[PDB]
């Protein structure tokens, strides 16, 4: 008796007092004080004011600068579009529902916001995986007579859409489901109930293996071999100071990306290990959704790491903002 069950929800609050209401009908001010709902709204507002300009500016400066429109950058545009799905499909609706105290859009809007907010975050995750594979193929050259062109970059972007749909669509057709999560103002995959009618247990395993373990292994391998190949080639040219300088900056950048991926990855692993063991207590209307609360920020720091620190995008964004010029 941890929470309260309904046909389309699970409110993480005991019902011995008879105060629980459907998160589609009445505010959930027993999960959290009204100011805690407002702080959720403020956090959504922060993500919107930082997420939309950075990600929209990425799409905009690509239009005004021809040198950005290379095939190896196509997957970066896919990342910026994915974050805009998170910004508009997830953060915006949550900011609206949070100020009511409950998900005012009903169960139909729960599937919609759940899908798009999950789709955007899933496109972003696999865009990072695809970019790691692309950089690995271009640098380590595992195929003897291979050149990465426009057709290959399109496959990689289209591949992210298949992977993201592979995660976001099954809950719409009966494998897992979309329910209000945490404070019941946004919607997402049901990791909180063992809903046997939709086989939630198998979907969590599938999510954990395919959309959690596999992305980590691919990123670590590709960048691992990449830094290995770069350091190996740089060792053969120790007389070139720029080669050593290029090797040092490639190492620092791969580290930054791998660390940034783990900052979004480890919270789920920490919640996993606490759910893997300790399977005997109620997770409050918050605990299990703490990784989600911080994984949203990937809509802000991923374009900062992968785009704003790209040498090309930075100068072009300065040029666009710058008007025309820029300090040289």
Ligand X SMILES: CCCCCCCCO[C@@H]1O[C@H](CO)[C@@H](O)[C@H](O)[C@H]1O
Ligand Y SMILES: *C(=O)CCCCCCCCCCCCCCC
Ligand Z SMILES: CC(=O)N[C@@H]1[C@@H](O)[C@H](O)[C@@H](CO)O[C@H]1O
Ligand U SMILES: O=C(Cc1ccc(Cl)cc1)N1CCC2(CC1)Oc1ccccc1O2
Beta strands in 133-183 (DSSP E): 178-181
Q: Rounded to the nearest whole angstrom, what is the least distance from the CB of residue 24 to ligand Z in the complex? A: 10
Residues 6+ apart with CB under 8 A from 19: 13, 30
Q: What is the 3-state secondary structure (H, E, C) of 6-57?
A: CCCCEECCCCCCCCCCCCCCCCCCCCCCHHHHHHHHHHHHHHHHHHHHHHHH
Nearest to 307 by CA among 153, 79, 11, 122: 79
The entry of ligand X, ligand U, ligand Y, none that residue 211 binds, CB within 5 to 8 Å by partner kind: ligand U
- Choice between 190 and 247, CB closer to ligand U: 190
H or E element that contains 202: helix 200-208
Binding partner of residue 323 among ligand Y, ligand Z, ligand U, none, CB under 5 to 8 Å per kind? Answer: ligand Y
Is residue 203 part of the contact set for ligand U (CB under 6 A)? Answer: no
Q: Can you say whether the dihedral through the CA atoms of 111, 113, 119, 122 is positive or negative?
A: negative
CA trace torsion 267, 272, 277, 282 (10° rounding)? 80
The binding track of 223-262 with respect to ligand Z, each residue x by CB under 6 A or -, is ----------------------------------------
**122 annotated to a ligand binding site:** no
DSSP secondary structure string for all residues of 111-124: HHHHHHHHHHHHHH
Rounded to 5 degrees, what are φ and ψ at 286?
-150, -55
Stretch that binds ligand Y, among 23-31, 124-132, 303-311, 318-326 (CB under 6 A): 318-326
- Our CB check for ligand X shows the closer of 74 and 223 to be 223
User: Nearer Cβ to ligand X, position 72 or 272?
Assistant: 272
Q: Which of residues 109-128 bind ligand X (CB under 6 A)?
A: 117-118, 121, 124-125, 128
- Give the footprint of ligand U on residues 287-306 (CB under 6 A): 295
Does the footprint of ligand U cover residue 265 (CB under 6 A)? yes
Q: Could you give the CA distance from residue 211 to residue 242 in angstroms, rounded to a whole number?
A: 38
| Chosen residue from 76, 119, 204, 222 binding ligand U by CB under 6 A | 204
User: Any binding-site annotation on 201?
Assistant: yes
Residue 155 CB neighbours (<10 A): 9
Which of 143, 155, 241, 321 lies at the binding interface for ligand Y (CB under 6 A)? 321
Annotated binding site for Zn(2+): which residue ranges?
Answer: 201, 279
What is the binding site for ligand X (CB under 6 A)?
Answer: 27, 40, 90, 94, 96, 99-101, 117-118, 121, 124-125, 128, 181-186, 188-189, 220, 223-224, 227, 251, 254-255, 258, 261, 264, 286, 289-290, 292-293, 295, 298, 302
């Amino acid at each position: 008796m941890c929470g309260t069950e309904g046909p389309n929800f699970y409110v993480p609050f005991s019902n011995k007092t008879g105060v629980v209401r459907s998160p589609f009908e009445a505010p959930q001010y027993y999960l959290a004080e009204p100011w805690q709902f407002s702080m959720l709204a403020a956090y959504m507002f922060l993500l919107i004011m930082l997420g939309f300009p950075i990600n929209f500016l990425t799409l905009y400066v690509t239009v005004q600068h021809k040198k950005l429109r290379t095939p190896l950058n196509y997957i970066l545009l896919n990342l910026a579009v994915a974050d805009l799905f998170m910004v508009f499909g997830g953060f915006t609706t949550t900011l609206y529902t949070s100020l009511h105290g409950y998900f005012v859009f009903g169960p139909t809007g729960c599937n919609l916001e759940g899908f798009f907010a999950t789709l955007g975050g899933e496109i972003a995750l696999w865009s990072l995986v695809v970019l790691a594979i692309e950089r690995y193929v271009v640098v380590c050259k595992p195929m003897s007579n291979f050149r990465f062109g426009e057709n290959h970059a399109i496959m990689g972007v289209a591949f992210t859409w298949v992977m993201a749909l592979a995660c976001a669509a099954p809950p719409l057709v009966g494998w897992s489901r979309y329910i209000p999560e945490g404070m019941q103002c946004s919607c997402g995959i049901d990791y909180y109930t063992p809903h046997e009618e939709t086989n939630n247990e198998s979907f969590v395993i599938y999510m954990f293996v395919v959309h959690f373990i596999i992305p980590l292994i691919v990123i670590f391998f590709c960048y691992g071999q990449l830094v290995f190949t770069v350091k190996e080639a740089a060792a053969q040219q120790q007389e070139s100071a720029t080669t050593q300088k290029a090797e040092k900056e490639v190492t620092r950048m791969v580290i930054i990306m791998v660390i940034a991926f783990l900052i979004c990855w480890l919270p789920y692993a920490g919640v996993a290990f606490y759910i893997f063991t300790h399977q005997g207590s109620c997770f409050g209307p918050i605990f299990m959704t703490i990784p989600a609360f911080f994984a949203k920020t990937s809509a802000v720091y991923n374009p900062v790491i992968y785009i704003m620190m790209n040498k090309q995008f930075r100068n072009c964004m300065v040029t666009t903002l710058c008007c025309g010029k820029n300090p040289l």
